[model samples]
Target: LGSDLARLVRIWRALIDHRLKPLELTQTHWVTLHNIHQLPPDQSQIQLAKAIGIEQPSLVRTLDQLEDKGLISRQTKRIKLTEKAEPLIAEMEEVIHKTRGEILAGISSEEIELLIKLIAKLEHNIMELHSH
Candidate 1:
């Protein structure tokens, strides 16, 4: 189950990356942008790094590149996506949505819901064990 879960995540990401290639950004770049869009507007660099599951230094590098491309701006310690990123982000969302639909083509909604519940239970159990 663990290996299958890991492989599924890898495959999903690879597929998304393939679909997003025309946008001319690396995987880390788009992932960081997407996370920033999802997270609250007031978060600091440290918070954004944690939310994106990357180290501060690495995120800083990505941020620098994004700033160069005019997709994002850094003000003091806070990072903000610029107006230039709005349309790109919208296109990214549409591509991702289409990819997800293709991936889950035959899976019923009920089955997906059950899988989510089971995963949540597994995560809860792991958390409980870690807290012991």
Candidate 2:
């Protein structure tokens, strides 16, 4: 199961990297964009990093890069996506759906739903253990 999980992560990253290549973005960068975009307008930088489950320093580094590209405005604890990032995120959403479809082509809806439930349970168990 451990090896399977590792391999699955590699495959997922490969697909995401290919999809993001044309936009000159890393998975970390776009993931951060998505996290910030999904958060409430008043969400703080501290909250964003916590929501994304990334370290403060690493999140700050990527936030700096996004700010440099004008994709988002990050000054202090307030972060907001720029006008340019809206369409880009929309396009990214489309690509992600397409990729997911390609990868889950043969999987039935019921099976996929079950898999999601199982994965969530696994995550919960891990979190419970970590909390101890």
Candidate 3:
């Protein structure tokens, strides 16, 4: 089940990447930007790393790339998106929204709700085990 879930995530990311190719950002870059846009402002690199499911060192490299592109800036510890990134992020959102709709096509809302609940339960169990 875990492996299947991982595969599903990869496939989903691939689909999103296909749709976002013209934006000129890799999956890692867009995903990190999207997370930073959604997360609270003035978040530390460590917090952003955790939210993006990557180590701080890896995130630092990604941040460097973003900084070079003028898409993001760092204020001591906090990461912030620049004016340059706003339109790109907006485009990403539109692409992801349509991609999600296409992926969820034919799946009823009730099934999606149930899946969400089940995934939450599974995540809770995993976290519980890890905390021991």
Candidate 4:
């Protein structure tokens, strides 16, 4: 497998960095915040580590950073988004959507269709791998 995926990855990371700058969160914390805020899934530090593809200790350190920033907290043994993170969650979502739009700018509808199909196929394959 190969890709011009680097450009896409860089742009996406830049978008994330832009959004996170205001809050002073690093890439790792930004990821944890976005995942926890948007997904609302059942997960612990151990699970989050797996989900985020980081080691458990690494994940906790990121969580700790968020906790110190008052952007996130733990309650009932679950990661919960805080009041501060809530408002920023909207901003994060907007930035992500805008970044995606920018990335797809000038792209034709047919190309979009094919791109979406390809991305979905990749996602499905990953999910199936996860389930196993």
Off by over 4 Å in 3: 130-132
Rank order (by TM-score, best first) = 1, 3, 4, 2
Which of 1 and 2 is ahead in lDDT?
1
Candidate 4 displacement at residue 1 in angstroms = 3.6
- Displacement of the residue 28 alpha carbon in candidate 3, Å: 1.7
Score every model by TM-score: 0.91, 0.79, 0.88, 0.81
Best by TM-score: 1
Model 2 vs. true fold: TM: 0.79
| Runs of candidate 4 exceeding 4 Å displacement | 122-132
Candidate 2, run of 10 with poorest lDDT: 72-81
Better of 1 and 4 by TM-score: 1
Can you write out model 4's per-residue Cα lDDT over 1-132, one digit (the tens) per residue?
Answer: 435776767667877687668877778888788778656566767877876668888998898888889988787777888897898888888888887788788999999999899989988998999989
Clashes of 4: 0
Which is better, 1 or 3, measured by TM-score?
1
lDDT of 4 at 57: 87
Per-residue alpha-carbon lDDT of candidate 2 for residues 1-132, written as tens digits (9 for 90 to 100): 979998998789678769878888887888888788778796866787898778989888888999999898856657888899989988887888889889999999999999999999999999999979
Give me the overall lDDT of model 1.
Answer: 0.90
Each prediction's Cα lDDT score? Answer: 0.90, 0.85, 0.91, 0.80
Q: For residues 53-129, what per-residue lDDT tens digits would candidate 1 score against the true structure?
A: 78999989999999999999877667888999999999999988898888888899999999899999999999999
Candidate numbers sorted by lDDT from highest down: 3, 1, 2, 4
Q: What is the lDDT of residue 56 in candidate 1?
A: 96
